[PDB]
Amino acid sequence: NSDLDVNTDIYSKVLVTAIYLALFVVGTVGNGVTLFTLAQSLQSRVDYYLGSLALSDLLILLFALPVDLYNFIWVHHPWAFGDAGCKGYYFLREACTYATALNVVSLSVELYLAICHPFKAKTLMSRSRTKKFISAIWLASALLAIPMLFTMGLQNLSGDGTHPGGLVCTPIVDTATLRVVIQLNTFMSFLFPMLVASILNTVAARRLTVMVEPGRVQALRRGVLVLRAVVIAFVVCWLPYHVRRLMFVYISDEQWTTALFDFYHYFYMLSNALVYVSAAINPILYNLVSANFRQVFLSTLACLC
Amino acid sequence: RRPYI
């Protein structure tokens, strides 16, 4: 009884709490004012993509954060929400990850096509078809996020399973299928797409150096660098997250001691913190490099006040 | 003792 509790420093709890607060405010204000700011020849399309990205960021920040703070870090048990809360939460997370990844890859594609083939850069995707492609990204992401509605659930692990304080939002499915779905998310929402995006970034950079209306290159290069920053930040932030989930299953029960338990939890704090950092980092990467986005940002926040 | 989160 009550063994389901987690040994975590109160100092660390308050730490990640404050951190999550900062990331929450910064990310929410950033992506929000970004979305209001978004409201053109080509940049309209990349504005739609950035719209999708900042939207996903807003989803994770607004919705996933307070759930994470309350139960995952502070409460531990019992799960206070409903099953729809759990399944919906994980589904939301995964869908957001897939959406983000697809947005990034598609952005790399459209950038490469923009710089290398300007003749086909106007005909390839009209804004209508672009929005259709965005909705396509959303729905596909949902389809890929579907397993979480089946994988995750609730189990009473109070030993007898009768004690109310033992209710836990946990994966109901077996260890094997768990390994399977974790692999699915790791490959499709991280490894493969970021690999493709990195490749397209390398090629874009090389052919950019090859290509070198002279002023236009100054803007497109800016685009490239921004993309690079986004990609590297993504991979570097999501890497321990996926490893943690791999760690979660690739370690046997006999190997699972209290040390690896608490360590897994501090690593959870760390990795998730890095995730929310990756969420809030986008508008900062936009403002810093673009300057114009920053001036109109300041203009709009001056409009609100 | 396997974690549940």
From Swiss-Prot, chain A:
Membrane-topology descriptor: Multi-pass membrane protein
Disulfide bond annotation, renumbered to this chain: 86-169
Free-text description of this protein's post-translational modifications in UniProt: N-glycosylated.
Compartments in which it is found: Cell membrane; Membrane raft
Residues exposed to the Cytoplasmic side: 39-47, 110-129
Alphabetically ordered keywords of this record: Cell membrane, Disulfide bond, G-protein coupled receptor, Glycoprotein, Lipoprotein, Membrane, Palmitate, Receptor, Transducer, Transmembrane, Transmembrane helix
GO molecular function: G protein-coupled neurotensin receptor activity; identical protein binding; protein-containing complex binding
Annotated signal sequence range: none
Region listing for Neurotensin binding, in residue ranges: 243-266
Transmembrane feature ranges: 18-38, 48-67, 88-109, 130-150, 180-204, 226-247, 266-286
Tissues expressing this chain: Detected in brain and small intestine.
Extracellular side: 68-87, 151-179, 248-265
Principal subcellular localization: membrane
GO cellular component: axon; axon terminus; cell surface; cytoplasmic side of plasma membrane; dendrite; dendritic shaft; dendritic spine; membrane raft
GO biological process: adult locomotory behavior; associative learning; cAMP biosynthetic process; conditioned place preference; D-aspartate import across plasma membrane; detection of temperature stimulus involved in sensory perception of pain; inositol phosphate catabolic process; L-glutamate import across plasma membrane
Lipid-anchored residues (S-palmitoyl cysteine): 303, 305
UniProt free text on domains: The ligand binding pocket consists mainly of extracellular loops ECL2 and ECL3, as well as transmembrane regions TM6 and TM7.
Family named by the database record: Belongs to the G-protein coupled receptor 1 family. Neurotensin receptor subfamily. NTSR1 sub-subfamily.
Described purpose of this protein according to its UniProt entry: G-protein coupled receptor for the tridecapeptide neurotensin (NTS). Signaling is effected via G proteins that activate a phosphatidylinositol-calcium second messenger system. Signaling leads to the activation of downstream MAP kinases and protects cells against apoptosis.
Quaternary structure and interacting proteins, as annotated: Interacts (palmitoylated form) with GNA11.
Protein name stated in the entry: Neurotensin receptor type 1
Organism: Rattus norvegicus (Rat)
Lineage of the organism: Eukaryota, Metazoa, Chordata, Craniata, Vertebrata
Swiss-Prot record, chain B:
PTM info: Neurotensin is cleaved and degraded by Angiotensin-converting enzyme (ACE) and neprilysin (MME).
Annotated site location: Cleavage: 3-5
Top-level lineage group: Eukaryota
Protein name: Neurotensin
Organism whose genome encodes this protein: Rattus norvegicus (Rat)
